[PDB]
Design a protein around this ligand. Structure first.
Ligand code: X0R
Ligand code: X0R
Ligand code: X0R
Ligand code: X0R
Lengths: 145, 145, 145, 145
């Protein structure tokens, strides 16, 4: 489904978000969390690139994977507990797995991964986030103002 | 999710993160994602190259608090005085971004969402038909990104 | 160009707009003007259906029509002056002409008509509107609260 | 144009008017327009048929001023307790519309934009993947409108 008058509005907000963040300003909390997370991810990938080779064959997540199985896989990443660094890792692994899915010509898995990750974030990680200083605490620790 | 302007969605944060990461590898979350990214990139290049033109824009372009859209439309018209093209449209985004940045600096953050709404308005009424007629943003992506 | 997370937000606002207006409430001024105009148009069409048969052959507006020629055609509708009733007529004639364009398998003309009508509204009619009580005066006279 | 939430575009008013008129003839401005229209229609039928269920919803569904999204998500979950389908999704829109209408009645117009944002949020996080997997809104249009 598409939306064309929103399209121009959407470009606007995205571009202004981008240019504000370059000066440490933020369109909104959501925009601040986005810049922060992108940045935290970049740094993460720079340091742990070694972990991102052949993720497909190791994580056992395919298009026909059930969310419960996805949940079991991610749970392994958080076996010794949830902390900010582990939450960044979660995003980075999702991202890398998407890229592989595109490399391997299974684009279909990308939107499956998005939806799985959103559910997991919703049910598992955001509640922890709310008990540990909230999304603003994420922005203080990883964002650029 | 974090508190946004129109929702506090977890999916929205995930989707932004995957879009970014897909783009770093030569891929796209979607056509919109690709447009957004090409436009950020084009804005960055424009602002560095024509850096000398980005001082006291709130004054040179007469955008103050209490400005009405008709005034804004009057100023932007001069930019497209000799016709629309993709360069002038990049200029339009960049100037509007620098205006917002200038606004926050001066503790006029109130201007920012107003500038957004004026830019979206101007696009819709003045720029859209030229854009469509010229192959759409799809063409922008192909010529730029 | 499409936009998918806005898509759900867009449905929301549209549906809530619709349900509010059914009780004489309005999401925004823009939403009030939309309900009012749709209604004014319905009434107009009911009374003057006789004027809407074979508009294509009489208005001389094709896909290759220049906006200046479009402007000349619409100007004829406003020859004896602009008033609210004539402004409603303008919308109704545009609408009917679009429908014929779809009947005659020239859909391409519809978006051309939208853009022409938006320019004409912008340059000719909205200024008159601003000197005659504004968009709220349109809502008082044609809307349902 | 009239003052909207995200812009004051003239095109936006035109486009809304032509969409309406195209739809009255069995046509569509676009896929989104068609979805919007089918959904309004489906909401109308649902609210008349299940009219008896639409009293004191602010109370039965505990949506008051100062309500947080987590609370809202908790209430809406019960509606989809036994699974998602297109009927339950129509119900979701209608109830949210009646809630907004109820809000304005009680001089709690402040709730309306908050309800919008919560509905958009819930759609994105909870309903989107089911919708996509089930053929998208394109399927809704084909089964309903
Ligand atoms: C094939 C194992 C992948 N992996 C690693 O390679 N870890 C590395 C450690 S170095 C990477 C690292 C660095 C810092 C932190 Br904090 C956590 C991890 C290793 O064991 O050598 C993992 O740590 C790991 C273990 C278990 C689950 C996952 C995952 C995942 C995942 C899948 C999908 C998705 F959408 C999101 C995800 F987080 C990731
Ligand atoms: C103070 C800036 C005035 N300005 C310039 O400095 N132009 C420069 C050219 S260098 C900038 C440039 C470079 C390439 C292109 Br294509 C277009 C412009 C000059 O001719 O010396 C403009 O190009 C100009 C002239 C008239 C109006 C505008 C504007 C604007 C504007 C205002 C608000 C907003 F949201 C967006 C806008 F684009 C911008
Ligand atoms: C082929 C003539 C169409 N037309 C009529 O048939 N008028 C009727 C009068 S009855 C319709 C009517 C009723 C009330 C009012 Br106020 C104004 C008109 C007639 O002369 O018998 C017009 O009045 C007319 C005359 C000149 C121009 C136009 C137009 C137009 C138009 C075209 C495109 C567009 F996007 C918007 C437009 F308004 C419409
Ligand atoms: C006070 C209404 C409670 N309610 C009912 O009356 N259900 C009725 C069924 S008749 C309504 C109906 C008819 C068909 C379908 Br499919 C689903 C519901 C009943 O079982 O007697 C619900 O269906 C119900 C139950 C639990 C939660 C909700 C809700 C909600 C809601 C809140 C906010 C919002 F923005 C959107 C929402 F959908 C609605």
């Amino acid at each position: 489904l598409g939306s064309m008058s929103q399209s121009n509005r959407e470009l606007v907000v995205d571009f202004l978000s981008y240019k504000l963040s370059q000066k440490g300003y933020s369109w909104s909390q959501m925009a601040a969390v986005k810049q922060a997370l992108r940045e935290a991810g970049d740094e993460f990938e720079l340091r742990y690139r070694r972990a991102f080779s052949d993720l497909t064959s190791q994580l056992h997540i395919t298009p026909g994977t059930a969310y419960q199985s996805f949940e079991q896989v991610v749970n392994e990443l958080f076996r010794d507990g949830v902390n900010w660094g582990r939450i960044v890792a979660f995003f980075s692994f999702g991202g890398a797995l998407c890229v592989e899915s595109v490399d391997k010509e299974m684009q279909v898995l990308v939107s499956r991964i998005a939806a799985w990750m959103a559910t997991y974030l919703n049910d598992h990680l955001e509640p922890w986030i709310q008990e540990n200083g909230g999304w603003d605490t994420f922005v203080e620790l990883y964002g650029n103002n």
